[PDB]
Amino acid sequence: PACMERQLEAARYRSDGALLLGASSLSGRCWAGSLWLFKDPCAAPNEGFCSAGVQTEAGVADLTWVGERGILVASDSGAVELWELDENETLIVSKFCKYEHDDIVSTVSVLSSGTQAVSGSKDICIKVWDLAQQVVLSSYRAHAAQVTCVAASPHKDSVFLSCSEDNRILLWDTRCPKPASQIGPGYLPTSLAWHPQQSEVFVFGDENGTVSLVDTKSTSCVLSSAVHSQCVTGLVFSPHSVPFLASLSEDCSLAVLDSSLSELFRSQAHRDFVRDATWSPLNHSLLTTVGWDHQVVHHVVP
Amino acid sequence: RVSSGRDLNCVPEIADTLGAVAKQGFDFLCMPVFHPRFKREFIQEPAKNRPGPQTRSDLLLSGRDWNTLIVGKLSPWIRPDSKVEKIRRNSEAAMLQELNFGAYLGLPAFLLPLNQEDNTNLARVLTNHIHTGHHSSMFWMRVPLVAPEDLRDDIIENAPTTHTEEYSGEEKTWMWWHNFRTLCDYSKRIAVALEIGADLPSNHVIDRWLGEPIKAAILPTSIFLTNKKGFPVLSKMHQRLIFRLLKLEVQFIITGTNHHSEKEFCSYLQYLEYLSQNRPPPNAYELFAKGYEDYLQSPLQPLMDNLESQTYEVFEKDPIKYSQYQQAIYKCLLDRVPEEEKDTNVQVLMVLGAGRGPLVNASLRAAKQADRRIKLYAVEKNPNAVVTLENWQFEEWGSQVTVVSSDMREWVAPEKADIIVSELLGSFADNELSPECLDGAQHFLKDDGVSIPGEYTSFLAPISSSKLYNEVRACREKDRDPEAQFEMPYVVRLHNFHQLSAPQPCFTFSHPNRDPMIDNNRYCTLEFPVEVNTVLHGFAGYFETVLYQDITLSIRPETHSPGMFSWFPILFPIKQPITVREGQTICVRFWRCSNSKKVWYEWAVTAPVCSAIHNPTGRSYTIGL
Amino acid sequence: RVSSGRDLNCVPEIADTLGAVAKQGFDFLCMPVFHPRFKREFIQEPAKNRPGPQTRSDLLLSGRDWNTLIVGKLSPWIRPDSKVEKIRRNSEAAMLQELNFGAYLGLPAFLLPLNQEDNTNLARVLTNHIHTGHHSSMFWMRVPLVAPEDLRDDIIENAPTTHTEEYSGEEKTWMWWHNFRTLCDYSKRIAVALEIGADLPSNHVIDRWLGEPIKAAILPTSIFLTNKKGFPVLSKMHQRLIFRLLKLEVQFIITGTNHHSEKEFCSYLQYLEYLSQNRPPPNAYELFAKGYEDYLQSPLQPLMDNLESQTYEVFEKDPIKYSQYQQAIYKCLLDRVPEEEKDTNVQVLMVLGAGRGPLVNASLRAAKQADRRIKLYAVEKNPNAVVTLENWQFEEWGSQVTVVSSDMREWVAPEKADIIVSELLGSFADNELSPECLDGAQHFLKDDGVSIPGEYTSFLAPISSSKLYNEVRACREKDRDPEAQFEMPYVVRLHNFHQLSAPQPCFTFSHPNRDPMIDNNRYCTLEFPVEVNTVLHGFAGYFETVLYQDITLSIRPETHSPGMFSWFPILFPIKQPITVREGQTICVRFWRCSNSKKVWYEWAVTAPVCSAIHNPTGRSYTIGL
Numbered sequence A: 001p002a003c004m005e006r007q008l009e010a011a012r013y014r015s016d017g018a019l020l021l022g023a024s025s026l027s028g029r030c031w032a033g034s035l036w037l038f039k040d041p042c043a044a045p046n047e048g049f050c051s052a053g054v055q056t057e058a059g060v061a062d063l064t065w066v067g068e069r070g071i072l073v074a075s076d077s078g079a080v081e082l083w084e085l086d087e088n089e090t091l092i093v094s095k096f097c098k099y100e101h102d103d104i105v106s107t108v109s110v111l112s113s114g115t116q117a118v119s120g121s122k123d124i125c126i127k128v129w130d131l132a133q134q135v136v137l138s139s140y141r142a143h144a145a146q147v148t149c150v151a152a153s154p155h156k157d158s159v160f161l162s163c164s165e166d167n168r169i170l171l172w173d174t175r176c177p178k179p180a181s182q183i184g185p186g187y188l189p190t191s192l193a194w195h196p197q198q199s200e201v202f203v204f205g206d207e208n209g210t211v212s213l214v215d216t217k218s219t220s221c222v223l224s225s226a227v228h229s230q231c232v233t234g235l236v237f238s239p240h241s242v243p244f245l246a247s248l249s250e251d252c253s254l255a256v257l258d259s260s261l262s263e264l265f266r267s268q269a270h271r272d273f274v275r276d277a278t279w280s281p282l283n284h285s286l287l288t289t290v291g292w293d294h295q296v297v298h299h300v301v302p
Numbered sequence B, C: 001r002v003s004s005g006r007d008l009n010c011v012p013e014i015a016d017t018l019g020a021v022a023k024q025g026f027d028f029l030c031m032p033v034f035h036p037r038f039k040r041e042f043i044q045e046p047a048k049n050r051p052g053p054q055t056r057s058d059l060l061l062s063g064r065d066w067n068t069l070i071v072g073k074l075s076p077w078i079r080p081d082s083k084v085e086k087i088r089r090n091s092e093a094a095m096l097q098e099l100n101f102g103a104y105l106g107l108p109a110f111l112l113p114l115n116q117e118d119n120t121n122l123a124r125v126l127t128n129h130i131h132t133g134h135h136s137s138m139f140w141m142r143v144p145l146v147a148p149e150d151l152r153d154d155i156i157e158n159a160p161t162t163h164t165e166e167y168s169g170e171e172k173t174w175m176w177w178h179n180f181r182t183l184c185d186y187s188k189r190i191a192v193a194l195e196i197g198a199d200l201p202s203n204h205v206i207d208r209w210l211g212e213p214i215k216a217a218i219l220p221t222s223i224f225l226t227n228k229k230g231f232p233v234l235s236k237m238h239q240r241l242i243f244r245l246l247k248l249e250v251q252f253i254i255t256g257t258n259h260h261s262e263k264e265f266c267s268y269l270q271y272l273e274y275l276s277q278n279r280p281p282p283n284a285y286e287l288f289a290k291g292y293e294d295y296l297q298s299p300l301q302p303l304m305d306n307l308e309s310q311t312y313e314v315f316e317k318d319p320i321k322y323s324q325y326q327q328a329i330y331k332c333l334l335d336r337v338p339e340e341e342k343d344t345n346v347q348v349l350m351v352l353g354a355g356r357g358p359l360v361n362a363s364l365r366a367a368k369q370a371d372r373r374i375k376l377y378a379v380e381k382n383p384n385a386v387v388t389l390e391n392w393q394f395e396e397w398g399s400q401v402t403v404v405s406s407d408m409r410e411w412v413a414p415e416k417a418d419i420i421v422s423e424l425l426g427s428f429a430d431n432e433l434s435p436e437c438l439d440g441a442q443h444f445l446k447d448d449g450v451s452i453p454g455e456y457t458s459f460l461a462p463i464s465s466s467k468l469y470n471e472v473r474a475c476r477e478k479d480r481d482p483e484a485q486f487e488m489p490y491v492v493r494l495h496n497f498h499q500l501s502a503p504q505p506c507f508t509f510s511h512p513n514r515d516p517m518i519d520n521n522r523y524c525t526l527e528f529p530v531e532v533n534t535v536l537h538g539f540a541g542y543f544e545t546v547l548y549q550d551i552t553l554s555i556r557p558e559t560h561s562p563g564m565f566s567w568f569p570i571l572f573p574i575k576q577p578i579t580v581r582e583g584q585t586i587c588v589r590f591w592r593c594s595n596s597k598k599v600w601y602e603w604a605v606t607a608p609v610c611s612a613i614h615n616p617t618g619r620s621y622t623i624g625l
């Protein structure tokens, strides 16, 4: 807990109002990882005000909440590990660190129920976890290049998405004998996020700054906009009943998108890669962004 | 032992990690030099200005550790052939960065992937880096045997793979590498790192990748089976491949995570060492030839130079040629003189080209074997070796042996000869003026003499070889034709190549030539059915012989005489690669031209393409009479 | 130890004799290959037909003994320059015979005498033997320091020697060798075996024979004095000569009979070993430089290439340059800030060309020494080393140090500078764009700044050297001017040569150049009094410097800084030898030309002869800006 490493990777608001900073060191002598829990995320990222934090063996590519005290972390090494937050909200304890992948873990995400997990590593294979029993239930080598993202279905426990650098976008199901389902020669997709309300809409952001909105069973590119001039790193819908879509790219720019992909907000607050965002579980006008300029800039969105 | 190093993608502490691998027994380490997920933009602010540093300090290891242990990796995000213009330009800049930092650190090799067909910009950036500054990193262009898009499990319910016969659809990967290499112009600083997937391709393809400068085979820990005791082993065919590569002295790399959680990770490298120990022993020939693989040697001038004593000495340790010569002489002596005249009929040999004495000693041994009385001569052009023959003749041989100091073609013999043991066979069985020399020697061979050898043949087999082509290509010298290194035969222990077909008889010589019109000029048309997409970089030559009725000598690999190191093969290059498509027929032609003064061979390919008549008039390589 | 072998002329049994010498401790043996008194006629019968053999059989030793121990001798009777036509032709044939048999056996060197002036036919036969076949014998052309006709005792009552001053009459022998060598065209396979007669010549001459590729000094047992204990020792001056030769790593030969009959013969070689042990120890510099003697290295491109980490590391072990820099900065800081302001006045350095950090560490050390507060920058072009500087700056240096990643000539400085520690001095003190780079850096140096170095000078000294001339001559490459290897400076540890005169200042640079018109072009006329007949093969360059008022760095041999291996000399060749006669004055001219893009040096000799303007327009060697 000496100092939070220079590079922020992921940030996720907990339901109770706390912040979960993922931060790895991508430069310098030691390339190590470190999680961070803030009960007053405004005080971040000043380590002196962190209610919790811990080191790992290597870098944190993406992390997720599992329940209220769990933590899903994907090391650069290729092993997903589960860090049960201690009941005091003061210490972070490793539970397992299963060396399962053969190369960098690039995404993780929890199925809708909250009992299983999926990860995707530049070893093209995607896996599925059982967090209670702590082994892999299924190891599908579906794509043909690295897996760029995954997004678990908020409403169906057996549905998740995953785009690749081999231009495939696959809607998946844990039941079917053949689980993959290619659901669109364009620009390479780079991020996915299911719609929180109309559960059969999902949006893939491409490598050229064009947010899309594709229907699984229709596959007509419905509504897309070149909001960013560089790779769309992440998309995260808002908690409003009619939610907005946050759009942060390698350009160091963040915007909010509607159902018509009409720009609401555009912030250049970050002076390097904006790496992931989240909305306030308390103040729905309040958004938190974390980037590789080590800043955590709080945005008030219209 | 065979080198072997761990491929990593997680090195939090460089010193700790390298220490751990060294304890595990690895020799080197393949690591990323800039962090893998550290996407650095070189074009537009404000990302263009992320304050440094950029990577681990140069000083974390000493120049010696950097130079001898580590092997760099080109970051995954770098994609200099992506379609997006921005990503193309960013990747160009990043790849230049990473390669230059690798050369600065000193790394002894750099790992670059070939994971798609469109690799032209990558080849361009890499060649521009090969031509900037003086550095000695070598580039291992990781390329899998079977593409990812064909290794995948059939789980896409809506776009299943085309499982039907796709012959070259199974060879797409070698073509990927072939295009990359040809763009980068066969640079001797680009070499392959053949990934080994769980399922191998057919036999022909795995013959393909040999001849390709494979510098390291990359074995994932996903292909190691589990044995009943709980440790990894490799199936019989994987072991076959691994033994081939072991012959090729590659450096094996264990990439991937540990899949045997019961046992620590070193078991894999223990298994590689186990297999290397158990590999079938090298034979008598290969033992001698080691230290000689793919090393081109300019052939000998038979009549213009005098062989120096090291050469005679080293070629007098051959275990088979002299046994064969003794046996042949024994049989011929028995044949020519029956039992009853074994005391009245005296047979006069004349060893032509006696050297330092080995044929004459063998001839005397055979005369004693066959209980027949002989009167040897020994014609030996090299006046030095006439010195050694004189010493023998005075000391040991006695009046039994005469010694003549003159050319076989010019000497005037006192009395005619019955047998003539001569050994003037070259690498290619007639490219050392054995025909000419013996044709000038038969004027003193009786009307029923016997000439040993009585015949000898030459053999061609069209080989493909990147290593040997680039060898000939780097055989340039100042002060001569910029393209004559491709027009002369090279004596070489052909090792790293791919014989594309079966050798076929090229030029058959027999002795004596009592044909009324002696003509030593030869023309030959040969067709070699090529049955796999590949390139053709030259025609290799071998030879068989017939000393006496059945006693033979041969270096032709299918019937190679045992442990005969007196002759290596020959390599006739051709001026350019001839991309050949499977099922075609490579057609080649030789003329063995010779005039009053000189000799030479002229070779051309007349199908599927046509190549320049190589060595016309012996402008590149003529054997001086 | 230093090699040493017995010269013989009586070897009745080759094996016994070689065994005896090996027991005595010698390493090799110089023996005749054909018997000395065995006069062989090659022209007219019936002597043309003496039945063989001709010599000892090749087999009396193994190829290894022949190749490593023995050294042949050219029979005494052979005189290829006698006037008699018959003897000329016989000697031609015999010498060819003996040399070819020597090459056949494999001998590692062959001993040929120069005992008269007329050696033209000998040189011709020897060059024709050097150009026939592929062999690797090397030829030691035995030549005495003082001719026989001048070593003789004055006992001829009727024809006494001319004892008066005969200056070059004392140098006739070196001219003998010079003519032989020039005829044979400086062939790298002809080397001298300097006989050592009892009475040495003057100092200048024994400086002569160095620079001449002396490969073995031949000490007769007639020059060894007797000490009171009854064993041989050599006078003080003979010891001086023997120490010079020992430096030159020659192979000493003990020719002659044993003249100390009281003691066995090994005492002589024991004495040579004794002296070699007692020779004055090599200094700190020579210890580093060993393994580097007369080895030409193409200089660096300062601005076009990035120095690789091995280079920085190896040049960071220099024991003096960094001490000097620290001392200079200490003194300048004290000078610029008095005691009382030691806490209010903050001095800002800007190390230009920071490399991996050594100057900046030394600057911080000096600031602590002189108790003054400083704010360092570090301009470092090489982006790699910007990586190492970033690592230092984050880890240890802290905010005290800034790091800039850009050309000194292009960077836009935040605040002006007081001192600027820069180290861009080359082998020749201005041939690495220190003037240009600092002249572009002074726009941000205050009106009273201090630049370290404040000055630096270059120095020329005309050297003679057969070894180094033939080195440059064998520096040819394909694909360029057949005569551009003679137009570029070579960084080299000049070892085997003869500086013909004293170095004189060539180009004086001082900084900053607040002269209203900055001009870095230089013209210089130099006269070097040459006072001994010799040849001139190039102009060597050195340099001195003035870091601060009195602290200096220098590689100029007379004032060489101690143990400074950061710089070797430089060697400016010239296209041909310039035979120089004693008393003359060698006149040379340099222009330091530079245009908007590039820099280069143009050098010519305008007396006693005239040589082509070398490197006009930098067609051979231009330093890229």
Ligand SMILES: CCN1CCN(CC(=O)[C@@H]2Cc3ccccc3CN2)C(=O)c2ccc(C(=O)N3CCC4(CC3)CC(OC)C4)cc21
Pocket: B288, B289, B292, B297, B298, B299, B300, B307, B311, B312, B314, B315, B317, B425, B426, B427, B491, B565, B566, B567, B568
């Ligand atoms: C120059 C490359 N060149 C020429 C020799 N020719 C051509 C040839 O026509 C010879 C000519 C000849 C001359 C005198 C007498 C007999 C023969 C027989 N035909 C070679 O083919 C050839 C063969 C082998 C080698 C070679 O590399 N080695 C020799 C064999 C060993 C390895 C090292 C094992 C042994 O270690 C104890 C030494 C090297 C070989």
Ligand SMILES: CCN1CCN(CC(=O)[C@@H]2Cc3ccccc3CN2)C(=O)c2ccc(C(=O)N3CCC4(CC3)CC(OC)C4)cc21
Pocket: C288, C289, C292, C297, C298, C299, C300, C307, C311, C312, C314, C315, C317, C425, C426, C427, C491, C565, C566, C567, C568
């Ligand atoms: C290429 C021949 N070349 C070039 C280097 N330049 C030219 C030059 O301008 C350098 C440039 C420079 C660069 C970075 C930083 C400082 C400097 C200083 N000026 C040399 O002059 C030069 C000097 C020495 C050597 C050399 O052979 N060695 C280096 C010294 C040792 C012997 C081996 C002892 C030590 O063993 C521990 C290594 C080799 C030398």
Ligand SMILES: C[S@@+](CC[C@H](N)C(=O)[O-])C[C@H]1O[C@@H](n2cnc3c(N)ncnc32)[C@H](O)[C@@H]1O
Pocket: B302, B303, B307, B312, B315, B352, B353, B354, B355, B356, B358, B359, B379, B380, B381, B382, B385, B406, B407, B408, B409, B422, B423, B424, B425, B437
């Ligand atoms: C290839 S070497 C081998 C000879 C010997 N039988 C041996 O086993 O080594 C042939 C020898 O024959 C001699 N020779 C070559 N050409 C000859 C010629 N035209 N006439 C007579 N002798 C010749 C040379 O001295 C050479 O050493």
Ligand SMILES: C[S@@+](CC[C@H](N)C(=O)[O-])C[C@H]1O[C@@H](n2cnc3c(N)ncnc32)[C@H](O)[C@@H]1O
Pocket: C302, C303, C307, C312, C315, C352, C353, C354, C355, C356, C358, C359, C379, C380, C381, C382, C385, C406, C407, C408, C409, C422, C423, C424, C425, C437
């Ligand atoms: C001869 S090296 C020696 C530098 C360092 N002081 C040392 O002791 O090794 C000079 C260094 O200055 C840097 N350099 C060379 N030219 C430069 C320039 N024109 N502007 C800024 N830096 C330069 C190069 O990186 C080079 O490593």
